[PDB]
Amino acid sequence: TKETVYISSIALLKMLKHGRAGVPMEVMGLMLGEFVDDYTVNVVDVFAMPQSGTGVSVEAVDDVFQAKMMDMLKQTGRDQMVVGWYHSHPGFGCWLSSVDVNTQKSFEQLNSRAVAVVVDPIQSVKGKVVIDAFRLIDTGALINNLEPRQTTSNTGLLNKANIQALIHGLNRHYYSLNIDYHKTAKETKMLMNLHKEQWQSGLKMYDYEEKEESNLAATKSMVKIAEQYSKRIEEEKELTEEELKTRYVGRQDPKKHLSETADETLENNIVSVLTAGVNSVAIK
């Protein structure tokens, strides 16, 4: 099979922190770790580089700053093999970085399997977490395992794929990025219990008790208005229809207003009950 990039917990967060300065500006970084084709792909540690005056080019990376930093990777257990160079760009329709041309072609000379990662949204953030990359092919890279068959490749219905500025070539040859994630048993145990909404946790009783009870007097008056507009919609609904046919372009008329009188009623009563059970719980 091909190389499917598995982003760790820290690998995704540092990419957003390194490109944190400015929308138009740009940074870079080095991916680390060791992996073998046919499954394993992993990035252990990531670290950024200072922004130079040339933007992103072959002269952007500083071998002096890289060598001085590389000596610090060994003593901390951070030393791994360099698997590629990740960047950050505002992004375009095609060729998301206009100043980045001759980098990857100089990168494939050392390792042909090395890739380059760029964070797509950069203020466009959605929550599907769409991230972009590029890898050169040119001559070769064939007579090998199956690159496309991995994930949703062999495409081109109409022109539509991804940003739809690409079609066949994309940058070069349609590398067909595959973005997954894998974590250990300790990392998965954290974000499940840690991340919910905000932190009241460990005791839910008195934290939101006073805040919700103080506004309960105003909440009682606001939920009454919602019921006032409930039956007024259903009253005018059955009053104007003597037919029970469709001239009314009403294809689903009732279920919308019926759910507005149900789901809202189902929302207002449960927050006055489930919270009321822990609203006192005084005993002695």
Partner 1 sequence: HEKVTIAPLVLLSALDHYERTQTKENKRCVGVILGDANSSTIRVTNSFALPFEEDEKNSDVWFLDHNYIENMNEMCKKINAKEKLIGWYHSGPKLRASDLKINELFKKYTQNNPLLLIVDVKQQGVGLPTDAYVAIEQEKTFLHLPCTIEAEEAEEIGVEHLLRIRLTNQLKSLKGLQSKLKDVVEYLDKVIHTILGKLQDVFNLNNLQKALTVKTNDELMVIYISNLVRSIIAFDDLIENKIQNKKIQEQRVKD
Partner 2 sequence: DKTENDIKALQSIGQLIGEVMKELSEEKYIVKASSGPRYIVGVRNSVDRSKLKKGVRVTLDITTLTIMRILPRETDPLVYNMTSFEQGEITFDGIGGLTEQIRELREVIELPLKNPEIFQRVGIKPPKGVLLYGPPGTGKTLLAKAVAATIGANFIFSPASGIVDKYIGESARII
Partner 3 sequence: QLPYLVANVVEVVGKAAVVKTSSRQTVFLPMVGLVDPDKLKPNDLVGVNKDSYLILDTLPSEFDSRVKAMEVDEKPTETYSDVGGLDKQIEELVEAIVLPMKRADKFKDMGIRAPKGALMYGPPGTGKTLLARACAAQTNATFLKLAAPQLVQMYIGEGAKLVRDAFALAKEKAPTIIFIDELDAIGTKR
Residues that bind partner 3 (CB under 8 A): 22, 24-25, 53
**Shortest Å distance, C-beta 112 to partner 2:** 36
Edge-to-edge strand ranges of the sheet holding 84-88:
46-48, 27-31, 84-88, 116-119, 132-134
**Per-residue mark of binding to partner 2, 10-39 (x: CB under 8 A):** -----------xxx----------------
Question: Which CB, 156 or 254, lies closer to partner 1?
Answer: 254
Residues 127-146 binding partner 1 (CB under 8 A) are 127-129
Q: Stretches 81-89, 100-108, 156-164, 259-267: which one binds partner 1 (CB under 8 A)?
A: 259-267
> In this complex, which beta carbon is closest to partner 1, that of residue 40 or of residue 145?
40
Measured in degrees and rounded to the nearest 5, phi and psi for residue 59 equal -90, 0
Pick the closer one to partner 1 by CB: 204 or 232. 204
Select 150 or 265, whichever has its Cβ closest to partner 1.
265
CB of 176 to partner 1, least distance (A): 21
- For residues 257 and 233, the answer to whether their CB atoms sit within 8 Å is yes
CB of 24 to partner 3, least distance (A): 4
Regarding 125 and contact with partner 1 (CB under 8 A), the answer is: yes
Say which residue the tokens 């539509």 belong to: 160
For residue 87, say whether it is annotated as part of any ligand binding site.
yes
What is the token pair recorded at 175?
A: 């590398």
Give the position of tokens 């390792």.
Answer: 111
The span from the CA of 15 to the CA of 54, in Å, is 21
Task: Report the C-alpha gap between 84 and 86 in whole angstroms.
Answer: 7
**Binding-residue total with partner 1 (CB under 8 A):** 70
Site for partner 1 contains 187 (CB under 8 A): yes
d(CA 60, CA 62): 6
- Both tokens assigned to 135: 């890898």
Q: Which stretch binds partner 1 (CB under 8 A): 100-108, 136-144, 153-161, 269-277?
A: 269-277
- Among partner 2, partner 3, partner 1, none, the one that 14 touches (CB under a kind-dependent 5 to 8 A) is partner 1
- The listed partner (partner 2, partner 3, partner 1, none) that binds 53, CB under 5 to 8 Å by sort, is partner 3
- C-alpha–C-alpha distance, residues 28 and 85, integer Å: 7
Rule CB under 8 A: which residues touch partner 1? Answer: 8-10, 12-14, 16-18, 20-21, 27, 44-45, 48-51, 65, 68-69, 72, 75-78, 121, 125, 127-129, 181, 183-184, 186-187, 189-192, 194-195, 199, 201-205, 216, 220, 223, 227, 230, 258, 261-262, 265-266, 268-269, 272-274, 276-278, 280, 282-284
Binding-site positions: 87, 89, 100
Rule CB under 8 A: which residues touch partner 2? Answer: 21-23, 123
